[PDB]
Design a binder for these strands. Structure first.
Length: 49
RNA sequence: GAUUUCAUCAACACUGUGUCAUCCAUUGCCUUCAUGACGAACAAUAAGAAGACCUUUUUGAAGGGUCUCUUUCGUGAAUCA
């Protein structure tokens, strides 16, 4: 009866892990894409000049 | 199967298409393919010289190494049919 709840408790941990993965990947892609956008803006300015 | 934007939640990465610009320089503009023929040219492999050159030896003269031509084997080149 201890594991009756202890083994089920892992659902919160796994959902937290997956949500952390989603947030981390979204944030990293967002910042990297912003940096790429800035680099492309520098290229566009260079090409305009 | 679920779920951050539902391309990217990004005005980036792209996909395909259309348009435009751009030889850096050079070459050529299939009848590319076959047979037969020919002017000319070429050398790996090898050979053959009263033409010419250099070095060394004491010199006239001698030793060695070179330039030039030809041929065996052949070789591509391609004006035309």
């Amino acid at each position: 009866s201890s594991f009756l709840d202890a083994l089920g408790y892992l659902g919160s941990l796994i959902k937290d892990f997956k949500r952390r993965r989603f947030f981390l990947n979204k944030a990293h892609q967002r910042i990297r894409n912003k940096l790429g956008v800035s680099f492309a803006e520098r290229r566009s300015q260079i090409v305009s000049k």
